[PDB]
């Protein structure tokens, strides 16, 4: 058809890479992938509900934490109704449904509609007490007053989706030979093939190449023979083919594919080269660069496939290694107990992980076993879901899918709520997956059709890998494409409006990085073009509206030109700043949008996440350390949107306004700053305490993932107290408690203070609270430094947080230790700070 030609140029557009384009293929897994998704899509189309699928009620099932009920003193909370240019002010009740309050309303006064929150894509309705939405949450959190306008349901048939159109050999691989069209380099170190069977990142077996000169061109001629039979591969296994002299290249091919059959024939696998253990080495894709880049040869000739009772110290010692965290290694003599009594530890969810990695995957009639094993899963299918252990099935180190279907399955009931929270990283595990299609990928496209603020998020997580990583790009561009043709056409607008917007402002952050070298003055020359390139857009071009991708209810409009800048920083990024598409919004403030690029945005992404979800832990025991976690999204090569936090300053610019010299602080700045912008002593008040939780919620987390060290520059605080840091992307101290933000604490030097006291209390608190979480945080953790990061030490880098964490000990040791580590930023105070400025003569 003509017509699906043109959408599919569309999809193209909105994905940024061709999934029909075959250039880079051995096989045709992908497009199989692309008619395999048709099908879990258009159940998910057909199955969601229209109203609710266009409202997306926002919407959680969690009690109210108690520090949120203290704010609502009288079992009542206030709504404030719209017309339009008329309001009036309701009493409501926490478990009052929406339904319950349109009515109550109607018969206050009574001389079809639906309730909409004032300024944004944001609704309260369906069977929720009003409590249980989010936006409601946030205003109480927040001290605003709730503002809702009665207005119609948006037609559910804007969403409408569009219709589509649809034996006992031993095993052997031959490596003929190398070839690279430019080597010159060191000199000529030799280099040889190392060839390795592996599944899940565990060496079943390997065979080396005889070393040779690194010519341009090497050949062997050579079968090598391995010690596994044919019969005994795993489904998932990969030939894993490396260059050495050492590592410089890899390259990896399935062996069975899938449609379960063995890899038979010729292949020339263009490889990818080494940086100079993470996810990028486990991808089956070649490196497309067919011309610069080494490529291996090969020939394959080679097809089917598809109890009693425990003693008692023997427990004791399947129980302890149990009870281990996820970074423990399990000796030999320890996985052969838990395989010899693998019955007596599938009564233990907890041991699944540990005893899926204690499965000879290179033995059938062990597979097989496991698979009878996993028949019996009525501990497991009754268990509570413990997303830590879920995440543990799936990383790196298993590829069976068997295994890995059950961690999925166990991902099913999560609320909306929690996938939102656990989204990135689940989207990042994709990364381990033996194959396109999967469970895991699947369970993603579902829920992201089911929920239109999970889907907006999605589509931004796979863009944001498509564009950046040549490893996975035509996975991620396959799933996503799966996603688009059932997200609805209001959607798809949406979605073309903002690549459009960030498309044209790349065009500009581009030519703009250019015109002042790298001394930091900032020419008003050079915020002419800025403006002039900004009004050129405006007209005919830069769309009338777009959805801030992160904060999808929120519609930008026009620029406000006069207040856009370039800021002041080596890289240059584009202070932007937007007016609001919503009449109805009760503010008249701007929205601010930082645009950058050359950085890796995505790290930035992963810690962000990773804050939100110890907020959510914190929150299960009561707790609220005023994170400010800004919204910040990768577009692109190194290049994105992030959130503008309204009136806010740096650390540093607090230092260097009364003074600012040459690596010289003051104690009393932040203090006094504090004052001037605080209108009454009350107010000075609520800013001392929101800045004594703040900071130690920063303290807390922040020595947690390793990135406390911090430069006052990348240290930010609100008007209000807010503490907070940004940029993450990539003597020592564990976090940064200065002696400005001691004064502030009431204290200096070796003295005490009730605000310190509370600092010190709320860290501990915190601190010991996370250690609940243990084995999540370890796994989050690993999985950032995998899919996130360059190289990293799969027990040394990961390690870190486990010491961070101080595994192993009881409550008070714990509480010491942190307690320490407050003690060690006070003995520096000022050293590191001043450091950086002592070295930019070093
Ligand atoms: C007045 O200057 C700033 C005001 C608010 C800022 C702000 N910067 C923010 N973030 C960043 O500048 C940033 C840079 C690179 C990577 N991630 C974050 N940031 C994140 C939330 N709010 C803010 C300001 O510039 C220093």
Redesign the pocket.
Known sequence: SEESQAFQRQLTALIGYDVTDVSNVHDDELEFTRRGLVTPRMAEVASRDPKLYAMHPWVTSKPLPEYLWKKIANNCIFIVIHRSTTSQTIKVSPDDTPGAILQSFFTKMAKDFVLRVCGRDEYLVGETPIKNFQWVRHCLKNGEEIHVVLDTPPDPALDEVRKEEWCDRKFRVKIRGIDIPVLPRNTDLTVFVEANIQHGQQVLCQRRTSPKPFTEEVLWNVWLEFSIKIKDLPKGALLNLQIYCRLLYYVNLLLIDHRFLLRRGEYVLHMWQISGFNADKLTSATNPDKENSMSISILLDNHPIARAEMPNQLRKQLEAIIATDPLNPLTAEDKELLWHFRYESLKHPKAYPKLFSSVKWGQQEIVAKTYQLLARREVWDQSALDVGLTMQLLDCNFSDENVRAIAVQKLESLEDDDVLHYLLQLVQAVKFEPYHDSALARFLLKRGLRNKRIGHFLFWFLRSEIAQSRHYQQRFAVILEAYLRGCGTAMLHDFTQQVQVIEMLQKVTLDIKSLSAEKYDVSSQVISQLKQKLENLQNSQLPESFRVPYDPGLKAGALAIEKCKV?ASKKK?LWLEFKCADPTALSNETIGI?F?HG?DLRQ?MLILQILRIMESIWETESLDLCLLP?G?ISTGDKIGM????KD???IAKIQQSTVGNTGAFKDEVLNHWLKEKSPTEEKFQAAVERFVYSCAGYCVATFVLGIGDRHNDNI?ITETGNLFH??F?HERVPFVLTPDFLFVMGTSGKKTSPHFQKFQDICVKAYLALRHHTNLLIILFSMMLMTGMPQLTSKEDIEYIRDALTVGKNEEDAKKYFLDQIEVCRDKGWTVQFNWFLHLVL
């Open positions: 800021m990024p930082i950058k950085d930035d800004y910040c992030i959130e503008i936090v806010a300053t740096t930010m940004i940029d992307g």
